[PDB]
Amino acid sequence: MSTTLFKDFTFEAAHRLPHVPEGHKCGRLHGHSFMVRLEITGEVDPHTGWIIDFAELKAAFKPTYERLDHHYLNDIPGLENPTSEVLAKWIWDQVKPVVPLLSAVMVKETCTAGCIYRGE
Amino acid sequence: STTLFKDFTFEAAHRLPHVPEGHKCGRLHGHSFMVRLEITGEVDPHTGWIIDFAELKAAFKPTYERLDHHYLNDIPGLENPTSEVLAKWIWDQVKPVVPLLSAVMVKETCTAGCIYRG
Amino acid sequence: TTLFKDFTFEAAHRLPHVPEGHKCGRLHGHSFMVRLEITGEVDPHTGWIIDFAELKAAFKPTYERLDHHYLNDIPGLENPTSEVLAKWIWDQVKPVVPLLSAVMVKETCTAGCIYRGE
Amino acid sequence: MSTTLFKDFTFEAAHRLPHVPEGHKCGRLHGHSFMVRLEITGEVDPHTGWIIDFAELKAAFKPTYERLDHHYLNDIPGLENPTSEVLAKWIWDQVKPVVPLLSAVMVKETCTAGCIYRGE
Amino acid sequence: STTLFKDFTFEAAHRLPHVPEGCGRLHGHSFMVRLEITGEVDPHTGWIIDFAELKAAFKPTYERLDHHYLNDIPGLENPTSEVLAKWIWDQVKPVVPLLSAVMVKETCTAGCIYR
Amino acid sequence: MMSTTLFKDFTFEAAHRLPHCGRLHGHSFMVRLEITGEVDPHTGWIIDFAELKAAFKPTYERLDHHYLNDIPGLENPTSEVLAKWIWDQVKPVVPLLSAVMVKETCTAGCIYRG
Numbered sequence: 001m002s003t004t005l006f007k008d009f010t011f012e013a014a015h016r017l018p019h020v021p022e023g024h025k026c027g028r029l030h031g032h033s034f035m036v037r038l039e040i041t042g043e044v045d046p047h048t049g050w051i052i053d054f055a056e057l058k059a060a061f062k063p064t065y066e067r068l069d070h071h072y073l074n075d076i077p078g079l080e081n082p083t084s085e086v087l088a089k090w091i092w093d094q095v096k097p098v099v100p101l102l103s104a105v106m107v108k109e110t111c112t113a114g115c116i117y118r119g120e
Numbered sequence: 121s122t123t124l125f126k127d128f129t130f131e132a133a134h135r136l137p138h139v140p141e142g143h144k145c146g147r148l149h150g151h152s153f154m155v156r157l158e159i160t161g162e163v164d165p166h167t168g169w170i171i172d173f174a175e176l177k178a179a180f181k182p183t184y185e186r187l188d189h190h191y192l193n194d195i196p197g198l199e200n201p202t203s204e205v206l207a208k209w210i211w212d213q214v215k216p217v218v219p220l221l222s223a224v225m226v227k228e229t230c231t232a233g234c235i236y237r238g
Numbered sequence: 239t240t241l242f243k244d245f246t247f248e249a250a251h252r253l254p255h256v257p258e259g260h261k262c263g264r265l266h267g268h269s270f271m272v273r274l275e276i277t278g279e280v281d282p283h284t285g286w287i288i289d290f291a292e293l294k295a296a297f298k299p300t301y302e303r304l305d306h307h308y309l310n311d312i313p314g315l316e317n318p319t320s321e322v323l324a325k326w327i328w329d330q331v332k333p334v335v336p337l338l339s340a341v342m343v344k345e346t347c348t349a350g351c352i353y354r355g356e
Numbered sequence: 357m358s359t360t361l362f363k364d365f366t367f368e369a370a371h372r373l374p375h376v377p378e379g380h381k382c383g384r385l386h387g388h389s390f391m392v393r394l395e396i397t398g399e400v401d402p403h404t405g406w407i408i409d410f411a412e413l414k415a416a417f418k419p420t421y422e423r424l425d426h427h428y429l430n431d432i433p434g435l436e437n438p439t440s441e442v443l444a445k446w447i448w449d450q451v452k453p454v455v456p457l458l459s460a461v462m463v464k465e466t467c468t469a470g471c472i473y474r475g476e
Numbered sequence: 477s478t479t480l481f482k483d484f485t486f487e488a489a490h491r492l493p494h495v496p497e498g499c500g501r502l503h504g505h506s507f508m509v510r511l512e513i514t515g516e517v518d519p520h521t522g523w524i525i526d527f528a529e530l531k532a533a534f535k536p537t538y539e540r541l542d543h544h545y546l547n548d549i550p551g552l553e554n555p556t557s558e559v560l561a562k563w564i565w566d567q568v569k570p571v572v573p574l575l576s577a578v579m580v581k582e583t584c585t586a587g588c589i590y591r
Numbered sequence: 592m593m594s595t596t597l598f599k600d601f602t603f604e605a606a607h608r609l610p611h612c613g614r615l616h617g618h619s620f621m622v623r624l625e626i627t628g629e630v631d632p633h634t635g636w637i638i639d640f641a642e643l644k645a646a647f648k649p650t651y652e653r654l655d656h657h658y659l660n661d662i663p664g665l666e667n668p669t670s671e672v673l674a675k676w677i678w679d680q681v682k683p684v685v686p687l688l689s690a691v692m693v694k695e696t697c698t699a700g701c702i703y704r705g
């Protein structure tokens with residue numbers, strides 16, 4: 001038995017991949033509508049009937065969200081190589097201290113491609 | 121090793137009774153709720169499936185009819201109709217008729233949801 | 239040049255003038271999607287008609303009356319069909335957004351209404 | 357009575373808007389997964405049973421597409437103020453000559469926001 | 477103007493007869509079809525017609541398209557999106573006289589609008 | 592910190608029918624390829640998404656705009672069979688493959704793990 005909760009956010013950002021070979025399109029300056037899913041695993045409270053309000057999860061993420069949205073990721077410390085993989089771990093590292101029930105972070109650069117980091 | 125899922129969508133009203141006064145989720149409202157039933161089992165060597173998708177549809181239909189175009193709070197067991205409670209409630213209704221049931225996901229909106237594994 | 243912005247709100251309604259027994263007459267709800275269309279001149283210097291965020295800000299007061307609410311309680315929405323709601327929204331927004339040229343309301347992902355000028 | 361045809365493309369680009377008031381988030385370097393819908397109108401051919409092949413409409417757009425995808429829009433001449441409105445007309449101006457049957461270009465910055473240019 | 481639309485999806489096979497050696501093969505799509513009606517809203521009911529009625533009016537035509545092979549249906553021997561839109565219109569127009577458009581999308585990224 | 596997964600979706604337009612619903616028809620089939628592995632400290636990824644496209648492309652082209660029932664191994668082309676079929680085709684080319692999901696429609700699917 002287990003209960004899991006998730007909430008998706010989308011942020012509009014620029015990035016470029018600094019470690020690909022000279023011809024690669026992703027080494028050019030570009031951007032994406034990045035989707036991030038924060039997944040939480042925990043017990044359902046008998047009174048609230050939830051693990052955590054989706055709104056708390058939003059509120060916890062907001063500070064990190066706002067550093068990402070409408071920004072250039074390469075200028076953010078720890079995102080000098082802003083792959084989806086690096087980004088999902090970085091989001092995990094920012095969010096985990098405030099959301100200890102965090103069990104996975106998914107980031108999708110496009111709606112057909114994504115990465116899931118679990119952390120624990 | 122092999123998992124199967126089918127998605128359904130229903131149109132229901134609810135409100136959350138145990139939230140503080142200002143919270144908008146305590147007001148009477150509704151959603152286009154989505155529910156995914158996941159099944160796990162061995163694939164039949166002849167039919168080439170665990171179970172026909174139709175069967176999942178037929179099995180779920182009675183529970184679906186209680187939820188669709190209905191007010192959740194009036195259904196026994198759904199007096200605090202969170203996504204979490206609803207997913208467990210759906211599991212409880214469907215598990216007895218679909219013993220291969222391995223998970224229930226409900227999404228209140230396209231960006232928020234709960235998965236219950238039982 | 240036509241510009242648009244989509245909004246989604248989670249609400250309850252019931253249709254009071256449907257034939258007794260039809261499921262739409264029972265208390266229920268939807269994830270409603272609304273699209274506000276404006277048509278007009280792109281300023282040479284700004285490069286837009288109006289900022290997407292200005293249109294959002296103009297819609298916000300109306301949006302808050304619809305979201306996480308029961309539509310029948312709102313004056314003008316006692317028969318809250320998709321058609322009535324599209325016209326209602328038009329009547330609320332056209333005053334604050336003069337360039338408004340269409341309102342689409344989607345009740346579900348597959349069913350909707352579009353209103354302009356009757 | 358009349359028949360319209362459309363084909364949808366998505367590209368991943370960076371941009372910023374240089375004439376928005378100071379502190380606007382749109383004025384910071386950022387990006388999107390842009391969607392563009394090319395709309396044509398005209399007669400169906402009684403033999404082929406279409407106006408044109410979808411693959412040929414794709415092929416026509418390809419040069420302009422590849423200028424947009426994985427690029428920074430502001431470097432492109434005419435996209436110095438790369439709003440959806442400017443972009444939509446810019447795409448019209450590049451694609452109309454190669455596809456005279458073009459009747460509308462929709463560009464969406466995000467899944468919930470966009471512009472449709474018709475020639476006015 | 478007040479307009480109403482309803483979308484359906486059918487799973488069917490087809491091939492295009494008037495193309496060279498290479499989509500000319502037997503294949504299929506999850507076709508999306510959108511029926512658009514234009515009409516006056518009734519003062520009492522609050523609608524043009526019930527969505528459920530539109531579903532019922534289309535149903536026979538949907539049964540004819542869903543889980544079928546389009547080329548066998550008379551009128552759809554060249555089953556392009558353009559021909560289909562107009563053909564679906566021929567079956568539905570008499571049953572739904574307020575019909576104003578039929579959009580068919582063979583993929584999520586490609587389709588046709590007939591008026 | 593721990594496990595990292597990568598996926599990529601593909602859609603192909605194909606005809607099929609089941610010999611055991613059984614009428615001739617087709618779908619816009621969706622397939623997700625899932626990969627698990629270590630992220631390289633230099634590249635910052637497991638493998639490039641485009642690399643995963645390239646590796647799948649030969650199997651893709653056999654499926655896209657084709658009749659599935661004529662393909663060796665897909666005599667009974669159920670999603671279950673198709674997901675497992677795809678796994679067998681793709682695994683040797685993509686060793687880090689951890690799951691294969693095929694969606695017949697938007698609302699129905701199967702996930703396979705070899």
Ligand SMILES: Nc1nc2c(c(=O)[nH]1)N[C@@H](C(=O)O)CN2
Pocket residue numbers: 017025026082083084085109597636637638639640641
């Ligand atoms: N694995 C992996 N491959 C990628 C990306 C990414 O973030 N991860 N980014 C893609 C892009 O930014 O275009 C290019 N390929």
Ligand SMILES: Nc1nc2c(c(=O)[nH]1)N[C@@H](C(=O)O)CN2
Pocket residue numbers: 005050051052053054055136145201202203204228
């Ligand atoms: N975790 C959790 N938070 C929620 C909900 C819910 O179902 N679960 N429902 C939301 C709502 O009904 O709007 C409010 N917040």
Ligand SMILES: Nc1nc2c(c(=O)[nH]1)N[C@@H](C(=O)O)CN2
Pocket residue numbers: 253262318319320321345480523524525526527528
């Ligand atoms: N035309 C039309 N038909 C409808 C609706 C609606 O709003 N308009 N609402 C639907 C509903 O509320 O479920 C039922 N049928």
Ligand SMILES: Nc1nc2c(c(=O)[nH]1)N[C@@H](C(=O)O)CN2
Pocket residue numbers: 241286287288289290291373381382438439440441465
């Ligand atoms: N009308 C209009 N308003 C906009 C944009 C745009 O492209 N058009 N771009 C948005 C952005 O780039 O964030 C901000 N606001």
Ligand SMILES: Nc1nc2c(c(=O)[nH]1)N[C@@H](C(=O)O)CN2
Pocket residue numbers: 361406407408409410411492499555556557558582
């Ligand atoms: N305009 C147009 N182009 C097409 C099609 C179609 O239906 N219309 N059919 C597509 C296909 O069915 O593969 C190929 N190209």
Ligand SMILES: Nc1nc2c(c(=O)[nH]1)N[C@@H](C(=O)O)CN2
Pocket residue numbers: 169170171172173174609612668669670671695
């Ligand atoms: N389990 C299962 N049931 C199915 C299918 C399928 O692929 N798997 N195929 C569906 C179809 O092709 O219509 C019908 N039912």
Ligand SMILES: [Zn+2]
Pocket residue numbers: 015026030031032109368
């Ligand atoms: Zn990128």
Ligand SMILES: [Zn+2]
Pocket residue numbers: 134145149150151228248
């Ligand atoms: Zn709710």
Ligand SMILES: [Zn+2]
Pocket residue numbers: 131251262266267268345
């Ligand atoms: Zn309703």
Ligand SMILES: [Zn+2]
Pocket residue numbers: 012371382386387388465
């Ligand atoms: Zn922008």
Ligand SMILES: [Zn+2]
Pocket residue numbers: 490499503504505582604
């Ligand atoms: Zn085709």
Ligand SMILES: [Zn+2]
Pocket residue numbers: 487607608616617618695
């Ligand atoms: Zn099928």
